[PDB]
Coordinates of C-alpha atoms and ligand atoms in Angstrom, one line a residue:
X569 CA 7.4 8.3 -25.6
X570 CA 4.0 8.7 -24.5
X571 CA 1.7 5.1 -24.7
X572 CA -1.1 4.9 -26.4
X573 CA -4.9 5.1 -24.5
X574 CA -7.9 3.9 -25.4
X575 CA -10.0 7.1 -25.7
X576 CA -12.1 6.4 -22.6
X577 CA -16.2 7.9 -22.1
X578 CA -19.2 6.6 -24.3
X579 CA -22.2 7.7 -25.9
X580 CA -24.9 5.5 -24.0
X581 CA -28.5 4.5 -25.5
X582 CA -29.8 5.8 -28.5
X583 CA -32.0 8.4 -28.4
X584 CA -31.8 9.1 -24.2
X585 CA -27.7 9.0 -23.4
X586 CA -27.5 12.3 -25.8
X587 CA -30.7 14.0 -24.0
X588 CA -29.4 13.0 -20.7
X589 CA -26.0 14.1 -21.4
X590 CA -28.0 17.6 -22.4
X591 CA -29.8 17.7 -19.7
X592 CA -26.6 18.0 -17.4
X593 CA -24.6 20.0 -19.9
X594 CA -27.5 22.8 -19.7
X595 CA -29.2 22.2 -16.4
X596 CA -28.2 19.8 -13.9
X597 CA -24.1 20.6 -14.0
X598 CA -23.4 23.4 -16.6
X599 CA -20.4 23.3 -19.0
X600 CA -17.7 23.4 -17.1
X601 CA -18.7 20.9 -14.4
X602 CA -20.1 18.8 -17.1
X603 CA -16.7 18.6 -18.6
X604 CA -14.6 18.5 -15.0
X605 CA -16.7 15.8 -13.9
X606 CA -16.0 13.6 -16.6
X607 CA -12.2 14.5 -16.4
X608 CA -12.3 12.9 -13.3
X609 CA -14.0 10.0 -14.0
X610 CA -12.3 9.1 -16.9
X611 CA -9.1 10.1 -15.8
X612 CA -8.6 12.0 -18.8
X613 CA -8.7 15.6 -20.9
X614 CA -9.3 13.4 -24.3
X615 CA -12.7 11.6 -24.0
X616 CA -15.8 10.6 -26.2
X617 CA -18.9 12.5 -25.3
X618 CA -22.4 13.7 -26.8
X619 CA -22.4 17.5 -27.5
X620 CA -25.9 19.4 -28.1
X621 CA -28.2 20.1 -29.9
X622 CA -28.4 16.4 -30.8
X623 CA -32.4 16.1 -31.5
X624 CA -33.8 17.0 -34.4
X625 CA -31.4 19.9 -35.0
X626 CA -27.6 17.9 -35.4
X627 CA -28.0 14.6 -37.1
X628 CA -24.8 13.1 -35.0
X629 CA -24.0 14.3 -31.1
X630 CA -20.8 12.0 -31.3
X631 CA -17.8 13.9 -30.5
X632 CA -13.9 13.2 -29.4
X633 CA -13.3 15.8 -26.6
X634 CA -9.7 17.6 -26.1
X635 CA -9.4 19.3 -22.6
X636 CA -6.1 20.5 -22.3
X637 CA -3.8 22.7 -24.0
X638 CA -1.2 20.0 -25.5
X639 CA -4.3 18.5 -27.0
X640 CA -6.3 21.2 -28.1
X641 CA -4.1 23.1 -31.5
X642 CA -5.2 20.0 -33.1
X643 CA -8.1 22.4 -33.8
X644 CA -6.0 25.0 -35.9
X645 CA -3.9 22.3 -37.9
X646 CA -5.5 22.9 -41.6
X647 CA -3.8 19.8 -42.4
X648 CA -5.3 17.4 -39.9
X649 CA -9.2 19.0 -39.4
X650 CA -11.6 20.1 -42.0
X651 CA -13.3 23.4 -40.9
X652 CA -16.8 23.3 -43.3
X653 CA -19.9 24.1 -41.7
X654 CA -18.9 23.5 -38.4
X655 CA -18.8 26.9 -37.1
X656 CA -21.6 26.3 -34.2
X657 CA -21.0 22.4 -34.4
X658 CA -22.6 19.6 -34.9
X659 CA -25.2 21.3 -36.7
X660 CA -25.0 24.5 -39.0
X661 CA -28.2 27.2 -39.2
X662 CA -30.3 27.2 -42.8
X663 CA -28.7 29.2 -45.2
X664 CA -32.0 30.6 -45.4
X665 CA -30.9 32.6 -42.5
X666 CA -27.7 34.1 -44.3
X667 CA -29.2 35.0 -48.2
X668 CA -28.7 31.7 -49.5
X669 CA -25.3 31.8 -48.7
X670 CA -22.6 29.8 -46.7
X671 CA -20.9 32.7 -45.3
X672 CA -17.4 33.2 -44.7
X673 CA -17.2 31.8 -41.5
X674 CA -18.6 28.1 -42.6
X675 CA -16.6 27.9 -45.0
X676 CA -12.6 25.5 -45.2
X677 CA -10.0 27.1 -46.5
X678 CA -10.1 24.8 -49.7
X679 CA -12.9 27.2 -50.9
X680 CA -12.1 29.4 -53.0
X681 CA -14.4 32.0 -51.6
X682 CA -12.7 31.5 -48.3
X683 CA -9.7 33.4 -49.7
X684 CA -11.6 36.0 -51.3
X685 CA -13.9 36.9 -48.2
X686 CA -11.0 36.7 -45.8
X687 CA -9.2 39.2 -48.0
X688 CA -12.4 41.3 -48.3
X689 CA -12.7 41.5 -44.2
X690 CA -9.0 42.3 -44.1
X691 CA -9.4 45.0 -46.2
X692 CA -12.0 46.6 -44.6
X693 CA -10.5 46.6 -41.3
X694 CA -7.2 48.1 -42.1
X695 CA -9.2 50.9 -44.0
X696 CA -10.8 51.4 -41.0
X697 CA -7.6 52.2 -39.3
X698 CA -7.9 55.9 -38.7
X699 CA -11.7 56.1 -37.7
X700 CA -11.5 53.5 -34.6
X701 CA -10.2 56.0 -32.4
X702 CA -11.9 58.9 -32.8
X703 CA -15.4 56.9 -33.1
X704 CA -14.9 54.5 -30.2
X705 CA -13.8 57.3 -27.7
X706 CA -17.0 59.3 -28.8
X707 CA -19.7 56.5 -28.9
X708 CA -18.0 55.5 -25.3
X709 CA -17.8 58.2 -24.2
X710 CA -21.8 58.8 -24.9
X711 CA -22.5 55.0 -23.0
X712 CA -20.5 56.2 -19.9
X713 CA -22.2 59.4 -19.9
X714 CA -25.4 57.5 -19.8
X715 CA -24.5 55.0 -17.0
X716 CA -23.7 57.7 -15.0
X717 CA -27.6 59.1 -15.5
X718 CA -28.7 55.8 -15.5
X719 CA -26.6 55.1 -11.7
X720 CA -28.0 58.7 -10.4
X721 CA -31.6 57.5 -11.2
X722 CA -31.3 54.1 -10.1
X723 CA -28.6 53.4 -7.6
X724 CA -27.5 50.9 -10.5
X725 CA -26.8 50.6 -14.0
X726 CA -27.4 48.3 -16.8
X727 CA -24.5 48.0 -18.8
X728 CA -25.5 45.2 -21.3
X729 CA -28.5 47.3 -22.5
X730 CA -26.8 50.1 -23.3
X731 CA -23.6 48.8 -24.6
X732 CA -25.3 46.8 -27.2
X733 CA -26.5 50.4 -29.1
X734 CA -23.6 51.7 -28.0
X735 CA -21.3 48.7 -30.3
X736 CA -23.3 48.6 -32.9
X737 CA -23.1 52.6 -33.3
X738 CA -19.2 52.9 -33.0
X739 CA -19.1 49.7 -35.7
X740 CA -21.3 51.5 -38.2
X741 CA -19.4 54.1 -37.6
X742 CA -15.9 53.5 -37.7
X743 CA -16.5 50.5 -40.4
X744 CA -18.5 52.4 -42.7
X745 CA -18.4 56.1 -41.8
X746 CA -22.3 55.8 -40.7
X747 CA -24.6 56.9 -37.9
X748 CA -27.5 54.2 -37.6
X749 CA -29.4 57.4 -36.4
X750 CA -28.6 59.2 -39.7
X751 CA -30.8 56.0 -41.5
X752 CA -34.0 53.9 -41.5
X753 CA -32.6 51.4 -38.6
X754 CA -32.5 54.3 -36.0
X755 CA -31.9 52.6 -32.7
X756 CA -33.1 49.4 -34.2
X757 CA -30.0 47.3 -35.1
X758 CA -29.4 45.6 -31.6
X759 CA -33.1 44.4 -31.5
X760 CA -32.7 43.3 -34.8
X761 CA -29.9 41.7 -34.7
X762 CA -30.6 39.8 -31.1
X763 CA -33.3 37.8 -33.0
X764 CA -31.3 36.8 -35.7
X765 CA -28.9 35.7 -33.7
X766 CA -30.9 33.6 -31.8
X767 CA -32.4 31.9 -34.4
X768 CA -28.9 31.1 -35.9
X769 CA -27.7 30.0 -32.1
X770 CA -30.5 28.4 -29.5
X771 CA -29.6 25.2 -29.7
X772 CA -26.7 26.3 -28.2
X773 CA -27.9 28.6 -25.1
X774 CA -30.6 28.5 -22.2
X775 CA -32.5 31.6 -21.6
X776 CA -33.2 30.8 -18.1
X777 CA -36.8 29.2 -18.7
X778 CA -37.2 25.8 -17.1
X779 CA -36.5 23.0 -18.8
X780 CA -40.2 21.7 -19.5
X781 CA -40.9 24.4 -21.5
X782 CA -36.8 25.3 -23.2
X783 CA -36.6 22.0 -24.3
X784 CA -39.5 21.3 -26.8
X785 CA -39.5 25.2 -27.8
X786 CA -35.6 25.7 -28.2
X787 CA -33.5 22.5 -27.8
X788 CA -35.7 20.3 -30.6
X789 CA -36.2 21.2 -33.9
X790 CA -34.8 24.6 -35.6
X791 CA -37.1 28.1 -35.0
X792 CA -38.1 28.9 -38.7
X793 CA -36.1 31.1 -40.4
X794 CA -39.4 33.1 -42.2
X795 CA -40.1 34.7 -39.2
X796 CA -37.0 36.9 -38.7
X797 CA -36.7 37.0 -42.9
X798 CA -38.1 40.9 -42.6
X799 CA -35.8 41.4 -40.1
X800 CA -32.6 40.4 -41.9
X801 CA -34.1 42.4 -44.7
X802 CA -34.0 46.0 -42.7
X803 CA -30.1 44.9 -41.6
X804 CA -29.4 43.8 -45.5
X805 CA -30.4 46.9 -46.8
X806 CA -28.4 49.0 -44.1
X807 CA -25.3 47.1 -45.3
X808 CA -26.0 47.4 -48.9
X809 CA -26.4 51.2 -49.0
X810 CA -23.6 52.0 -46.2
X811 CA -20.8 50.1 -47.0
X812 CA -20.0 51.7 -50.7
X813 CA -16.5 52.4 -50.5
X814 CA -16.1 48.9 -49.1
X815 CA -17.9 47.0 -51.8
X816 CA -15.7 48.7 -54.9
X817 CA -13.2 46.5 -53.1
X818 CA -15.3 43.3 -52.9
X819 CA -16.2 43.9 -56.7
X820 CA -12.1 44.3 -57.1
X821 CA -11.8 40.7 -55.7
X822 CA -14.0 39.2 -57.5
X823 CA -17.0 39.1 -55.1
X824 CA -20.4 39.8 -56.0
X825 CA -22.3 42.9 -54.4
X826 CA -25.1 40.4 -53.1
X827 CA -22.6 38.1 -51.3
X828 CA -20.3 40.9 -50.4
X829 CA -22.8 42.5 -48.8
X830 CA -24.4 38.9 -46.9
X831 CA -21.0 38.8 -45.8
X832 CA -20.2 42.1 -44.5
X833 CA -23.5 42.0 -42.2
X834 CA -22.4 38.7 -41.0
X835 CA -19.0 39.6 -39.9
X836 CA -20.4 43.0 -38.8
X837 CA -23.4 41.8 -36.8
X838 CA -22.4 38.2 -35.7
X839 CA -18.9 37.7 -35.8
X840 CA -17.6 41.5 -34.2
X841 CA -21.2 42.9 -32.7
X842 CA -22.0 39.2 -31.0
X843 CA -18.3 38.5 -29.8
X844 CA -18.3 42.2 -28.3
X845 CA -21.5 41.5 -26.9
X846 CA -20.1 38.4 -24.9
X847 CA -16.5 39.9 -24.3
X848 CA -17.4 43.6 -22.8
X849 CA -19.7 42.5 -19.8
X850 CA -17.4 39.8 -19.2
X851 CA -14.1 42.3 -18.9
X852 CA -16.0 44.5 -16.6
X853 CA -16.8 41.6 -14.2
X854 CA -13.9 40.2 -14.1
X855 CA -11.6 43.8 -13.8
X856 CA -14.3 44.5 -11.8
X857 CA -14.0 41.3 -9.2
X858 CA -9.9 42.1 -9.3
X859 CA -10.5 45.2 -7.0
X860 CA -10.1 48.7 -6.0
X861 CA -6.1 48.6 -5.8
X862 CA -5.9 47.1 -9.4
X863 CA -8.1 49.8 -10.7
X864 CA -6.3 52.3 -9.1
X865 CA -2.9 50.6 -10.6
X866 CA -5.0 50.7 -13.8
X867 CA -5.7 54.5 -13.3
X868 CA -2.4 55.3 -12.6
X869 CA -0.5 53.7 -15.7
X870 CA -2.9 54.8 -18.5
X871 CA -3.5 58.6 -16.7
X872 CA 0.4 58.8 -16.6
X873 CA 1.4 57.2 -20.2
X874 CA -1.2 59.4 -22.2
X875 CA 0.3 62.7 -20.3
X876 CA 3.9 61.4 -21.7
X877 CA 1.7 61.4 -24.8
X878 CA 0.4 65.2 -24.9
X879 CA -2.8 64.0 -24.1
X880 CA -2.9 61.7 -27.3
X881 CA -4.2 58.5 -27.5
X882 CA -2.3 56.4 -29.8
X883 CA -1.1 52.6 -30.9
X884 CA 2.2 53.6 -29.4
X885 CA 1.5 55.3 -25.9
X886 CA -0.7 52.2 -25.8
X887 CA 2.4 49.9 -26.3
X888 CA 3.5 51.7 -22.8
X889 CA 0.3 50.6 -21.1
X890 CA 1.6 47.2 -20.1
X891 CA -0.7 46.6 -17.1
X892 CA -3.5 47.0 -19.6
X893 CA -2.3 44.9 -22.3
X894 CA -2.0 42.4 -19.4
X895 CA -5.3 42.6 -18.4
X896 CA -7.0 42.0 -21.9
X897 CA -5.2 39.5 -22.4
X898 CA -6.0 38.1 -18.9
X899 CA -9.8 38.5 -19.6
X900 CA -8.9 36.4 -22.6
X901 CA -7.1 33.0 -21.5
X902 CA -9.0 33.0 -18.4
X903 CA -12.6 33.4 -20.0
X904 CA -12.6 32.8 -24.2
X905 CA -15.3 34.6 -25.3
X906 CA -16.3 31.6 -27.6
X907 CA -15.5 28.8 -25.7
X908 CA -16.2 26.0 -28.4
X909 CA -13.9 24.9 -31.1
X910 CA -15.1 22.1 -33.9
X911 CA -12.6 19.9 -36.8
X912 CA -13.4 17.0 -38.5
X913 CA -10.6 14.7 -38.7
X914 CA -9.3 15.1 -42.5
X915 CA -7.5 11.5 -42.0
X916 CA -6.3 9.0 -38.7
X917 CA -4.4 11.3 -36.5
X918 CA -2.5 10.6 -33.2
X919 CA -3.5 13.3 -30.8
X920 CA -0.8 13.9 -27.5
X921 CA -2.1 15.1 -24.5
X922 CA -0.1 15.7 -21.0
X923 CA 0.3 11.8 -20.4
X924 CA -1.1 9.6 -22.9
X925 CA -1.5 9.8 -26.8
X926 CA -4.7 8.8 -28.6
X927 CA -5.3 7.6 -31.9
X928 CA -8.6 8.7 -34.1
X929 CA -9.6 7.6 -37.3
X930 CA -10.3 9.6 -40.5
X931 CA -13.9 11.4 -39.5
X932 CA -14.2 12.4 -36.4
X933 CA -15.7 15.2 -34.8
X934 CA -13.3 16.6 -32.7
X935 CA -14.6 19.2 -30.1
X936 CA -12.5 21.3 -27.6
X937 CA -14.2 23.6 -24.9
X938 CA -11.2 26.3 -24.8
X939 CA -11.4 27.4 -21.0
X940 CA -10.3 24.1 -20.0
X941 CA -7.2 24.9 -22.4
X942 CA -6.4 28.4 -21.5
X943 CA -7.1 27.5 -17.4
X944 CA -5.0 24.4 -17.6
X945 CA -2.3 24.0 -15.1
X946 CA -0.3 22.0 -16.5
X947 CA 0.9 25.1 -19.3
X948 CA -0.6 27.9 -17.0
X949 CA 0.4 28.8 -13.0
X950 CA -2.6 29.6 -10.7
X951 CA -4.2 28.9 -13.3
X952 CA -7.6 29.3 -12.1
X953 CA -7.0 32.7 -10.8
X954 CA -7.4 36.3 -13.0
X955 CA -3.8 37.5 -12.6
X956 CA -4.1 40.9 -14.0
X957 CA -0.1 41.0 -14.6
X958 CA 0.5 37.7 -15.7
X959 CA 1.5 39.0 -19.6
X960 CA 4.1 41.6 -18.1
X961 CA 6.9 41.3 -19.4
X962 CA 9.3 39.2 -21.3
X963 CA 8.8 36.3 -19.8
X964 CA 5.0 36.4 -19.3
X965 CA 4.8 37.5 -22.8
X966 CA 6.3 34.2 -24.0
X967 CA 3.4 32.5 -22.7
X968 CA 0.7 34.3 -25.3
X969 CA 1.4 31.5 -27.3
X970 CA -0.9 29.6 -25.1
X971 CA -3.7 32.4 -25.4
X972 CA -6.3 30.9 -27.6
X973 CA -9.5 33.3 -27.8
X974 CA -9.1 34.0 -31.7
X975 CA -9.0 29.9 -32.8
X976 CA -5.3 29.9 -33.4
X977 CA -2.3 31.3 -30.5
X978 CA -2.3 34.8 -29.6
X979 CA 1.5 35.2 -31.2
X980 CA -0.2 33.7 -35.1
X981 CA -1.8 35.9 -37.5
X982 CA -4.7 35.1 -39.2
X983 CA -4.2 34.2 -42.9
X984 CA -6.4 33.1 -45.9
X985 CA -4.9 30.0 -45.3
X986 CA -6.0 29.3 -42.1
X987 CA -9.5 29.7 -40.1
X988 CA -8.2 32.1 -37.3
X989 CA -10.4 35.3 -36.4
X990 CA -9.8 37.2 -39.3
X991 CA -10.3 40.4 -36.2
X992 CA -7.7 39.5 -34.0
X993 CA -5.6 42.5 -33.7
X994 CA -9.3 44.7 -34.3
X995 CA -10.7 42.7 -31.1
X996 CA -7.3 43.1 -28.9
X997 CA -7.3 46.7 -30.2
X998 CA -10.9 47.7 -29.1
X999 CA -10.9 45.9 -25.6
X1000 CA -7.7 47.9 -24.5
X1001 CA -9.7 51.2 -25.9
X1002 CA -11.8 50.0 -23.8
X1003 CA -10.1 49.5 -20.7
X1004 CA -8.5 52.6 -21.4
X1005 CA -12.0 54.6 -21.7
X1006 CA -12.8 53.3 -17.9
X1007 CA -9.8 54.4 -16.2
X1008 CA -9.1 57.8 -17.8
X1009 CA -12.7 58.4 -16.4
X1010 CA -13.2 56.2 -13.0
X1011 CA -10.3 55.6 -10.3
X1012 CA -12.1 52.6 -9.5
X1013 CA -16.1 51.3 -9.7
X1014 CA -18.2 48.2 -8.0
X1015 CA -20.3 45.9 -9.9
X1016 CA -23.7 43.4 -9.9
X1017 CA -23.7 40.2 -12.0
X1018 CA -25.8 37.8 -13.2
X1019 CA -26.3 35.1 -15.7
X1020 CA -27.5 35.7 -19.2
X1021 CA -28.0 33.8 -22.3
X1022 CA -24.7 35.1 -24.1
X1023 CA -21.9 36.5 -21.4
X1024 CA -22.8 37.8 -18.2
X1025 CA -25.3 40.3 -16.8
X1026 CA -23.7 43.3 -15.1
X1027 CA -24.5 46.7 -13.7
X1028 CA -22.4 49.3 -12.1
X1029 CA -23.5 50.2 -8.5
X1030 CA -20.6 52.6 -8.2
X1031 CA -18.5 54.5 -10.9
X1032 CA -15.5 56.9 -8.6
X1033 CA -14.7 59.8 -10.9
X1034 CA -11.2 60.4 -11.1
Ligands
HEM1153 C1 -14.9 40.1 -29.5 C2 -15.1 39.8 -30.8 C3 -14.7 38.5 -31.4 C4 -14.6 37.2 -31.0 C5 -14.8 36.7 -29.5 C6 -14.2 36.4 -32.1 C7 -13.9 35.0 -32.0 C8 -13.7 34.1 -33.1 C9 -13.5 32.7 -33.1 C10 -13.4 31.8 -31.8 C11 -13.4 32.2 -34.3 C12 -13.2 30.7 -34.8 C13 -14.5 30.2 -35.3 C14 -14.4 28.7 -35.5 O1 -14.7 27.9 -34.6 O2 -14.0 28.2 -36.7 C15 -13.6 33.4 -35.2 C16 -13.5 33.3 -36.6 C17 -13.8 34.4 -37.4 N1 -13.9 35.7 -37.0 FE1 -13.7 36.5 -35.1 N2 -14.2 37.1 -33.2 C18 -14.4 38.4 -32.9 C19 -14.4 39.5 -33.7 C20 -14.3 39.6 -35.1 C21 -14.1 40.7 -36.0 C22 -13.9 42.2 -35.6 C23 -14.1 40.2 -37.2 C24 -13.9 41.1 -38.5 C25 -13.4 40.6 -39.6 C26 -14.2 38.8 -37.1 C27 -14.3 37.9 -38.2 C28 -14.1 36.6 -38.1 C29 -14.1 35.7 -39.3 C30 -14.3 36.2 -40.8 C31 -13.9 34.3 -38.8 C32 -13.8 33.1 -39.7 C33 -12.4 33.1 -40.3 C34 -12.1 32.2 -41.5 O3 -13.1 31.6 -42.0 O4 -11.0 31.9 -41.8 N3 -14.4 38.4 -35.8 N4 -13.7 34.5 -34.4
T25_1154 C1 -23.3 35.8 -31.4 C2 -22.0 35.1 -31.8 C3 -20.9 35.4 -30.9 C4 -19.5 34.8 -31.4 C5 -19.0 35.4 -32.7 C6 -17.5 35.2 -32.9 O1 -17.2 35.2 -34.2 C7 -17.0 33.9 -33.6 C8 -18.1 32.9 -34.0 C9 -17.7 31.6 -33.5 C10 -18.7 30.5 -33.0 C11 -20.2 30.8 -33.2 C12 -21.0 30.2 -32.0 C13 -20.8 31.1 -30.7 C14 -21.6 30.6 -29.5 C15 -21.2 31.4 -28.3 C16 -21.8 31.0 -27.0 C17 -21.4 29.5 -26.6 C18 -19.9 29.3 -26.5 O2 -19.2 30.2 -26.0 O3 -19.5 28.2 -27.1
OCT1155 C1 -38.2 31.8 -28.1 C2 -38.8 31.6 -29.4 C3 -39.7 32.7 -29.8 C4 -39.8 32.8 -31.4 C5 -40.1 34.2 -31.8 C6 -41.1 34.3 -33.0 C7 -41.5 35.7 -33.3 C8 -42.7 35.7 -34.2

């Protein structure tokens, strides 16, 4: 059996070991070297550490850290870790932000709303199931259109600050059978919702300033909700007046128009628009940084399987894609969109890692940054490389168990009874349309990146028509 460790790190002083430990997590090493570092001194992928915010924004940085994929599914066991109002952490935004509501997301499957809410989302995206198609290859089709005037003009193109209008567009409408252009928003929504989500999430980001002037503005005390409450407003009432047909099923389950609605701009706006926002530029850097052969491979298999299709693009000529479905998948486990999980310890568990087992009491915040999971080696081979085939076939398939992006393994399905990305097969779904959009355009295409404050910055410098 495996002995049992001390859990080895420690919080330091009061009041300066958290903003120290801040101070590299944001600035001086950045997440992942934060967390390697301390691997290596500790010896060890289970360790105490301070998280941010810490400040005036989380009342307790004190955390249990699990680095490595035996460890880490702690964080799905419903049994072992409550899930309330820990969503972004060690702190949770003012309600004020969301209606006056805890929202879906913050919510443990104890609740009895939790069931409700889940089964509200659910029901939305599978009557959604015949407009994704049609509305992602037109609104993408419109983005790559525009890239291609943008790369003419420029010698480069922005992809982030397109593709934002360009999400937010196909969501309205393949969700809700509405063009934002067709209503008072217009263009508006990413704007909108941008704000909003950064004063739900900047404890949690840099934005590039320097740190004399991020720290008091951003990384001390929450920005006030008031100011983005007109905002919210112009985004509520979009909701509210779109998404009829989907709230005679909220009133069905026993959901009130007000909180359906609080709910459905949440999981439209945050949860899908904001993981899209991360995930998208991310793919195309990382396809992109794979090369011109893999492209061309890329090319070759969707341009072939949608001509054994009659030129139709469906769920089964995509099951013949398997070089795609790799690659998602690949984007996936090697970067996880949302690479922080939270659970409070519901009573003393014993947690086994690789070597060692460790004991915590009833409690505990336990916190696991996901890449360190999804990239360990001890579960994955070269595991710090993007293999784009690594998923062909039946034995690479076997290892999607180990895929984590959506909170739970990538062979689970999200339930009411657990807190796994109630989008899961919508997310897997869109990024393959998405891949697939690129390739039956572009036999290949060269990229520019940079940082930003959610995923990556990236603009095409090159886009080969087929
Ligand atoms: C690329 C886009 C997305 C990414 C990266 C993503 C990722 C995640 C992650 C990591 C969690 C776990 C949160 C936690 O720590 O507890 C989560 C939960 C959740 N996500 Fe997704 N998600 C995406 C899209 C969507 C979509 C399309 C929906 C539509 C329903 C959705 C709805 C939800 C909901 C409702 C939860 C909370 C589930 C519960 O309370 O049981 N997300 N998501
Ligand atoms: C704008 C929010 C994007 C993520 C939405 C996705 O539905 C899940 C929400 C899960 C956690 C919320 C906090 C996300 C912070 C993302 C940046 C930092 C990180 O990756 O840990
Ligand atoms: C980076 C914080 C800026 C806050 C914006 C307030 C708009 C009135």
């Amino acid at each position: 059996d495996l002995p049992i460790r001390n859990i080895p790190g420690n919080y330091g002083l009061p009041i300066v070991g958290p903003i120290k430990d801040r101070w590299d997590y944001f600035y001086d090493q950045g997440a992942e070297e934060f967390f390697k570092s301390r691997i290596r001194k500790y010896n060890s992928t289970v360790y105490r550490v301070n998280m941010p915010p810490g400040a005036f924004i989380a009342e307790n940085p004190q955390v249990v850290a699990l680095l490595d994929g035996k460890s880490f599914p702690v964080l799905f066991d419903v049994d072992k870790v409550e899930k309330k109002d820990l969503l972004t952490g060690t702190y949770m935004p003012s309600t004020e932000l969301t209606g006056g509501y805890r929202i879906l997301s913050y919510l443990d499957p104890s609740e009895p709303k939790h069931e409700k809410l889940k089964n509200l989302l659910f029901f939305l995206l599978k009557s959604s199931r015949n407009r994704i198609f049609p509305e992602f290859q037109a609104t993408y089709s419109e983005l790559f259109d525009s890239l291609e005037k943008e790369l003419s003009l420029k010698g480069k193109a922005d992809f982030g600050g397109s593709s934002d209008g360009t999400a937010f567009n196909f969501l309205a409408r393949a969700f809700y059978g509405t063009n934002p252009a067709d209503t008072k928003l217009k263009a508006d929504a990413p704007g909108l919702i941008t704000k909003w989500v950064l004063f739900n999430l900047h404890p949690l980001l840099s934005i590039g300033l320097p740190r004399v002037i991020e720290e008091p503005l951003i990384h001390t005390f929450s920005l006030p909700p008031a100011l983005v409450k007109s905002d919210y407003q112009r985004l509520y009432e979009f909701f509210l007046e779109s998404a009829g047909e989907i709230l005679v099923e909220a009133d069905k389950l026993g959901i009130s128009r007000e909180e359906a609605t609080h709910n459905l701009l949440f999981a439209t706006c945050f949860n899908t628009w904001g993981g899209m926002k991360i995930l998208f530029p991310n793919m195309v850097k990382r396809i992109g940084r794979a090369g011109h052969q893999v492209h061309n491979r890329l090319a070759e298999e969707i341009r072939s399987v949608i001509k054994s299709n009659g030129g139709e693009l469906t769920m089964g000529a995509i099951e013949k894609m398997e070089l795609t479905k790799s690659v998602v998948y690949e984007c996936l486990r090697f970067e996880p969109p949302v690479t922080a999980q939270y659970g409070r310890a519901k009573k003393d568990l014993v947690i086994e890692s690789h070597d060692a087992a460790f004991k915590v009491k009833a409690g505990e915040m336990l916190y696991g940054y996901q890449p360190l999971a999804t990239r360990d080696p001890k579960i994955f081979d070269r595991a710090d490389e993007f293999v784009p085939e690594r998923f062909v076939g039946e034995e690479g398939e076997k290892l999607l168990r180990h895929v984590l992006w959506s909170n739970g393994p990538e062979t689970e399905t999200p339930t009411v009874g657990n807190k796994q990305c109630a989008g899961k097969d919508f997310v897997v779904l869109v990024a393959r349309l998405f891949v697939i959009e690129i390739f039956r355009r572009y036999d290949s295409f060269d990229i520019e990146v940079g940082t930003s404050p959610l995923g990556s910055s990236v603009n095409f410098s090159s886009l080969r028509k087929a």
